[PDB]
Amino acid sequence: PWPEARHLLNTIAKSRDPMKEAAMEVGFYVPMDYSPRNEEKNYQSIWQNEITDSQRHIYELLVQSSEQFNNSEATYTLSQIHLWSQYNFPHNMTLAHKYLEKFNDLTHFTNHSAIFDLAVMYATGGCPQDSAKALLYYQRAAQLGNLKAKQVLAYKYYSGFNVPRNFHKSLVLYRDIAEQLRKSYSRDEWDIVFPYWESYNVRISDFESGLLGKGLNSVPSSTVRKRTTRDASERRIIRIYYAALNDYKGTYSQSRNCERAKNLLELTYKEFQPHVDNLDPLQVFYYVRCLQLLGHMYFTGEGSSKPNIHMAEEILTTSLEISRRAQGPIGRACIDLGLINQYITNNISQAISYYMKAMKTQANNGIVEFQLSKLATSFPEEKIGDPFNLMETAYLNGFIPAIYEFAVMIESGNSKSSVENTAYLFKTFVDKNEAIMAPKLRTAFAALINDRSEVALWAYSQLAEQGYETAQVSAAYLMYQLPYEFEDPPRTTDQRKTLAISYYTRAFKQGNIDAGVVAGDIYFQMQNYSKAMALYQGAALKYSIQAIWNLGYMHEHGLGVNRDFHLAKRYYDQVSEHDHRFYLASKLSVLKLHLKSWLTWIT
C-alpha cells in the first residue's frame, strides 16, 4: 500500500516556512503555562474538525501499512510527521516515542538520526530521564559517525556537566569535527568568498521586553539585524538604497531576495549615470554606496547565474574614480578589487597596495588579514608583517576560516599552547560555523511564527544540548518566564520546572548572567532558600544589580541567614552605589528598614 501512499504524499508540501514566502510580496504568542489535559483536548478537537477527509484516508492507510507490515519506511515518515508537525498534522510526544521505539527495534541500531532523537528524548524526560541510556545512545551514534552526536559529547566533556571534567577527549572530538567541516568545503568558497548563510542564532525574548525586565539586564540585547533604516529627489536615493540593502541582507521576519535587488540596482545605475554631476551635496554618497553594493553582487554572482568579472571590474573602477572626489568610503570597493586581481588575474603588487590601503578601514571584517597571511606564507621576501600576527588580528576580528587556520598554527607550535585554549578555539569555531551543525534554527522560527509552539520547544531543546547558549535560553524561556508581580505563578508540572532550572543553570555557567538570576528566582518560588544564595552570589560577583537588591531582600527576612540588618543596609548601600538611576529605590528600602527598626524599638 506504500507506493500509492507516497504518490499521494507527494502532493501536500509538508511545511511552508513563511520567512521565505514573505519575500514575494509582525509578532507571535508564547504560552505561559502547560497542562496535559488541555493539550489532549486540543488534539481531540483538531482531529475532529480541522483535518480534511483526504488526509483522513491517507493517514489511515498509512497506519494500516505501518501496523500490518513492518514496512520500516512508513514508520519513519509517520514518525517525522507526528514529531515535526508536517503535512498539517499536530504534535504528539508519546506516539512519536512509540514509533521511534518500533523503528529502533526494526533497524537494530543502524539508522543514526533515529538513535540521536531517541537519546535526546531519553535525556530530556519529555516522553523520567536517565543519563546512562542517553550516554550509551550518544556513544552508539558517535560510532556510525554522526556529527551532532560527537559535538554534544564534546560539549558534555568540556563543560563538566553530568560527567567529570576532561579536556583531552573534548579536544580530540573538536579536532575531528573541525577536520570534517573543513573537508566539507570546496577550494573556491573557502579561498575566494565565503557563502553567506543567514544567521538565526539569536535568542528568543529580545524582540519583546527582555529577561527580568527592561533596562535592568546587564548583557546587551542580541538582535543584530532587523529592518535597517534611518524630499522628492533627495529622499528617493535614501529610499532606493535602503530598499536594496534590506532586500539583500535578509531580516528575521522576511528572508532575502536577490534578483529583485539586482534588477533594481541595474535600472537605477543605468538611468542615473549620465548626469551624476549635479548630486554633489549628499546624494553622491548613497549613489557610490549603491555602486559598491551592486559591484560586490556582480562579483559574487548571487542573484544571477554566474559572476561577471569584467563588468564588475569596470563598474568598480568607475565607482572608485567617483569616490576619489568627495573622498567617500572606499572599504568594500578596494577590498573586492584586491580580491579579483589576486586570483582572477595574477597582478599581485596592486593587490598588496589595495590591501594596505584598505587595512585600517571599518568595512573589512577579517578577509584582508587572511589574504595577507596566506600571501606572506607563499612569498616571505615581501617583508609584509608577520603571519602569526595577521592570524591573531583576523581571529580576534571574527572571520570564520581564520579561526581554523589560527587553531592549526597555534597547535603546531610553543606559543603558550595550553590545551584549554586549543579546546576553546575549536569549540568556538564549531559552534560558529552554524551552517551544517545547527540548520534547524530556521525551521524552529518557522514553526514558531505559525503558532505551532510545542515543536519549537522540541527543536530548541535538542539544540541546547549541542552547547548553543542561545538555544538554551530560548528553550528555558519557552518553558518558564518570570511572572508579573501580584499575579499567580505558572501552573506547569514539577518536571518542566526542574528541567528549566538545569537549562538556565548551564546557560549561566556558559557565560550568560541573567539566567542565573532567573534560576535563583525559580528556587525562591519553589521555596528552597538554600541553593538560592549560591546562585545569587554567583550573579552578584559579576555586578548584577537586581541580584544585589534581591540578596539584600533575602537577608533582611528570616529566611536562610537570620535577620542581620547590618549586612542588609550594607548591600543596599552597595546597590545604590554601583549605579545611578536606582538611588530612590535603595533609599526607600533603607527607609522601610529603619521604619521596621523603630516599630521594633517600640516593643
Binding site: 527580568l212 525586565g213 527592561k214 533596562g215 535592568l216 518570570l482 508579573y484 508581580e485 501580584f486 544589580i545 537586581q546 537588591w549 534581591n550 538611576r581 536606582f582 530612590l584 529605590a585 526607600l588 528600602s589
Partner: protein, 280 residues
Amino acid sequence: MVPENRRKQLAIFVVVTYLLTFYCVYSATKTSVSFLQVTLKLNEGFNLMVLSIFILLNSTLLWQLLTKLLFGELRLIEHEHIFERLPFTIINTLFMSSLFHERYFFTVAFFGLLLLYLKVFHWILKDRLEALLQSINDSTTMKTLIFSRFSFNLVLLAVVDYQIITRCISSIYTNQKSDIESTSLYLIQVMEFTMLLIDLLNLFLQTCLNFWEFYRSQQSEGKFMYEKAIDVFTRFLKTALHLSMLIPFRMPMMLLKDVVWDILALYQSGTSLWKIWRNN
C-alpha cells in the same frame, strides 16, 4: 485669602491629583516584574512630573495647615504683604535652583521650599509684632504670659533654624569630598538661614527695646536713635558675615549680588551715622 469658588477648584485639583497619581502608580505596577523595575519606571519623565505635582500640592497643604495652627488666622494686611513680596524671593529661588543643573535637582528644590516657608513665617511674625504694637493695651502689663506666647513663637523659629544650620555645618565639616559644589550649595543654605537668623536677632532686640521702654514708662532720649543704631549694627553683622563667608569660597556671582546691596545699605548707614553725629 480663599474664596469659596477657589476652594471648590482646590477640591477638584486635589482629588484629580490623587486620582492621577494612584492610576499611574497602579499602571506602572501591574506592568512590571520587580520593585526595582517599577522604581525605574516611576523615574520616567511624565510620571515623575505627576509625582512631583503630588508632592508639591501635599506639601503646600501641610504648610498651609501648619500656618493656620501657628499664626491662627491671617489679616488682610499680612496677606497683601505676602502677595506683594513673594515673587521677588520666588525668582531668587528660581535663580539659585537654575544655578545648579540636573545633577543637583531634588535636594535644591527641597531646601528652597523649606527656606521659602521660613521667610514667609518671618514676614508674618514681623507683621504680627507690628500688629501687637498697634493693638497694645496698657490695662495689663507686658506679662510674662503674652510675652511668653510671642517669644515662644520667636524661639521656635530660632531653635529650628539653629538646629538646621548646625546640622548643615556639621555635614559640611565632615564631608570634605570631591563634590565641593554640594558643599557650596550647603553654604548657600547657611547664608540664607543666617540672614534669617540676623532678622530674628534684630526683631528680638527691637522687641526687648520696646518692652524695656514699656517697663520704664510703667515703673518710672529719643528711641529712634537707639533703633537706628541697632539696625545699622545688625547691618554691620550681616556685611561682616557675608564677606567672611563668601570670600573664602571665592564666588563670582553671589558675592557681587549681595555686596552691592550691602554697600547701598552702608551708604544709608553713613547717612544715619552723620545724623548720629548731629545728635551727638
